[PDB]
């Protein structure tokens, strides 16, 4: 059996595929898919940047999609921000 | 309430804090604390690496971007992203399709 | 132009050599992608080149636009992945100390 | 012998290490290292954004350094931009 930390990492994979498997390329989250990901999975202080602002930041190769590596950029930034907020209370 | 993604990130933060905490206050992971986290909570994802203590120490050195023999959470979370990426790559190792399917990931 | 610019120019020129052949001048169809991989990535993708089904699924994975062809934006992600994979090969099982590169991808 | 394309990919690794091996962590390019990297390796239309703007965009985990994966973000963006420039007058 995997540990709780290891389960959390595999669960992050599953979270991404809930949106990447909606349509098109299996490992591509398009702009409208990213909007739903942000609205469902991220807290308000992350959503407040705007889905279009996040999408432009994450689509590194400007191909109109966010792949899994680019999604991990969002995960890293969400984690650093969540740690910082927990480190202020 | 928290989303699935928020809970996963919370698990990462709390696991980091369980080994870094110093006199009840948040801190950084030294090499000894990093090895204990890796030995226990990454015993499957880093099963082979855990057999070579020098390999674990060099992973620490590679992540120690601040060159202070300590892993802040910012330094540590890069390992979490790499292992998440590596586990997904394991799910698609030698994939021929068609369609999308995940084989077992890291440590399985 | 700098070393980095010349390397990027090599990537662009190689892509263009195959994308001009058929269909749209700035996309690779599957046949041209296989030819590029077979010739210009014969070492970096040596094992994958032995299984045509694997090459076709790499194409499908890179086809983020879901249009059965690779624009340069889609193709350059393969270049970043292979560059990363080669550097990971140089540090495979690294124990340190210091920095050292073993041979990279393609045993070179 | 590696092909010319494969040599180009390995040369991109060597470019990064010219600056990451200057000081500190072997796979970290600090703020002053990145400014030198941009001034030496990238064309004017890339440099004009400014080293500080590039550094903020590349330092995903906000740890004060650019590692190799974060450097590949710059390579991807330089490559996409250089391809567009090849089709312009
Ligand atoms: Na998709
Ligand atoms: Na993209
Ligand atoms: Na074409
Ligand atoms: Na450095
Ligand atoms: Na960084
Ligand atoms: Ni997948
Ligand atoms: Ni073109
Ligand atoms: Ni290296």
Three state DSSP letters for C2-64? CHHHHHHHHHHHHHHHHHCCCCCCCEECHHHHHHHHHHHCCCCCHHHHCCHHHHHHHHHHHCC
**How big is chain D by its Cα radius of gyration, in Å?**
13
Q: How far apart are CA B88 and CA A13, in angstroms?
A: 7
Task: Kindly state the helix (H) or strand (E) to which residue B7 belongs, with its residue range.
Answer: helix B4-20
The total of structural domains in chain A comes to 1
Length of chain C: 108
DSSP H stretches of helix in chain D? 4-20, 31-41, 44-47, 51-58, 68-86
The total of structural domains in chain C comes to 1
**Half-sphere exposure (Cβ direction) of C1: Cα atoms closer than 13 Å:** 9
Region of C107 (left: φ > 0; alpha: ψ -120 to 50; beta: rest) is left
Burial class of residue B17 (count of CB atoms within 10 Å of its CB; 0-12, 13-18, 19+): middle
The DSSP symbol for B92 reads T
Q: How far apart are CA C48 and CA D32, in angstroms?
A: 40
Length of chain B: 108
Report CA B37 to chain centroid distance, whole Å. 9
Measured over the CA atoms of residue D6, residue D12, residue D15 and residue D16, the dihedral's sign is: negative
Burial class of residue D43 (count of CB atoms within 10 Å of its CB; 0-12, 13-18, 19+): middle
Task: Kindly state the helix (H) or strand (E) to which residue C70 belongs, with its residue range.
Answer: strand C70-71
Cβ D67 vs Cβ B78: under 8 Å: yes
Counting ligands in written order, which one lies closest to the CA of residue B90?
6
Q: How far apart are CA C30 and CA C70, in angstroms?
A: 8
**How big is chain B by its Cα radius of gyration, in Å?**
16
Residues in chain C within 8 Å Cβ distance of A31 = none
How many Cβ atoms are within 10 Å of B102's Cβ, its own excluded? 15
Q: How far apart are CA A50 and CA D47, in angstroms?
A: 27
Cβ D76 vs Cβ C80: under 8 Å: yes
Q: How far apart are CA B104 and CA B31, in angstroms?
A: 30
CA distance D27 to chain C (A): 9
Q: How far apart are CA C16 and CA C25, in angstroms?
A: 8
Task: Mention every residue, 6+ apart, whose C-beta is less than 8 A from residue B62.
Answer: C91, C94, D25, D26, D27
3-class secondary structure, B3 = coil
Location of structure tokens 């990447």: A20
Q: What experiment produced this structure?
A: X-ray
Q: Which pairs count as long-range contacts for C11-18, CB under 8 Å and 24+ apart, including other chains? A: C11/C76, C11/C79, C11/D5, C11/D8, C11/D79, C12/C72, C12/D79, C12/D82, C12/D83, C12/D86, C14/C40, C14/D4, C14/D5, C15/C72, C15/C75, C15/D83, C16/D86
**DSSP secondary structure, B37-55, as one string:** HHHHHTTTTTHHHHT-HHH
CA nearest A31: which of A67, A70, A6, A64? A64
Report CA C92 to chain centroid distance, whole Å. 20
Region of D2 (left: φ > 0; alpha: ψ -120 to 50; beta: rest) is beta
Bridge partners of D66, per DSSP, are D29
**Half-sphere exposure (Cβ direction) of A33: Cα atoms closer than 13 Å:** 23
Q: How far apart are CA A6 and CA A13, in angstroms?
A: 11
Q: How far apart are CA D57 and CA A57, in angstroms?
A: 8
The DSSP symbol for A42 reads S
Q: CB-CB: which of A57, A60, A80 is closest to D62?
A: A80
Angle at D70 between CA D67 and CA C46, to 5 degrees: 95
3-class secondary structure, D57 = helix
Q: How far apart are CA B78 and CA D67, in angstroms?
A: 10
Length of chain D: 89
CA distance C70 to chain A (A): 10
Site from B65, B72, B86 to mutate, D interface, most D CB atoms within 10 angstroms? B65
| Ligand 5 centre distance from Cα of residue C73 (Å) | 24
Enumerate residues with CB within 5 Å of ligand 7 (an ion).
Answer: C 26
CA nearest D17: which of D66, D61, D56? D66
CA distance A78 to chain D (A): 10
Q: How far apart are CA B7 and CA B46, in angstroms?
A: 22
The DSSP symbol for B57 reads H
Q: How far apart are CA D34 and CA D49, in angstroms?
A: 13
First to last CA, chain D: 36
Angle at B40 between CA C90 and CA C93, to 5 degrees: 10
Residues in chain B within 8 Å Cβ distance of D62 = 74
Bridge partners of A66, per DSSP, are A29
CATH of the domain at D60: 1.10.238.10
Residues in chain D within 8 Å Cβ distance of C83 = 9-10, 12-13, 72, 75
Bridge partners of D29, per DSSP, are D66
Measured over the CA atoms of residue D38, residue D44, residue D45 and residue D50, the dihedral's sign is: positive
**How big is chain A by its Cα radius of gyration, in Å?**
13
CB burial of C47-70 (b: ≥16 within 10 Å; e: otherwise) equals ebbeeeebbbbbbbbbbbbeeebb
CA nearest A7: which of B5, B49, B90, B8? B8
Location of structure tokens 């399709």: B97
| Ligand 3 centre distance from Cα of residue D89 (Å) | 22
3-class secondary structure, D64 = coil
CA nearest C10: which of D88, D41, D11? D11
Q: For this experimental structure, what is the resolution in angstroms?
A: 2.1
CATH of the domain at C35: 1.10.238.10
Q: What phi and psi, each to the nearest 5 degrees, are found at residue B71?
A: -110, 110
**How big is chain C by its Cα radius of gyration, in Å?**
15
- Structural domain that includes position C5: 1-108
Residues in chain C within 8 Å Cβ distance of D76 = 76-77, 80
The DSSP symbol for A53 reads H
């Amino acid at each position: 059996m995997l540990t709780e930390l290891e389960k959390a990492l595999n669960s992050i994979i599953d979270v991404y595929h809930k949106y990447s498997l909606i349509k098109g390329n299996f490992h591509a989250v398009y702009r409208d898919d990213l909007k739903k990901l942000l609205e469902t999975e991220s807290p308000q202080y992350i959503r407040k940047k705007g889905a279009d602002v996040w999408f432009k930041e994450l689509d590194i190769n400007t191909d109109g999609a966010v792949n899994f590596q680019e999604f991990l950029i969002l995960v890293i930034k969400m984690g650093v921000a969540a740690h910082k907020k927990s480190h202020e209370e | 309430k928290m989303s699935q993604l928020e809970r996963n990130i919370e698990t990462i933060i709390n696991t980091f804090h369980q080994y870094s905490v110093k006199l009840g206050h948040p801190d950084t992971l030294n090499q000894g604390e990093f090895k204990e986290l890796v030995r226990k909570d990454l015993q499957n994802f880093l099963k082979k690496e855990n057999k070579n203590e020098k390999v674990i120490e060099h992973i620490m050195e590679d992540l120690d971007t601040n060159a202070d023999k300590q892993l802040s959470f910012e330094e540590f979370i890069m390992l979490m992203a790499r292992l998440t990426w590596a586990s997904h790559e394991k799910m698609h190792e030698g994939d021929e399709g068609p369609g999308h399917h995940h084989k077992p990931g890291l440590g399985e």
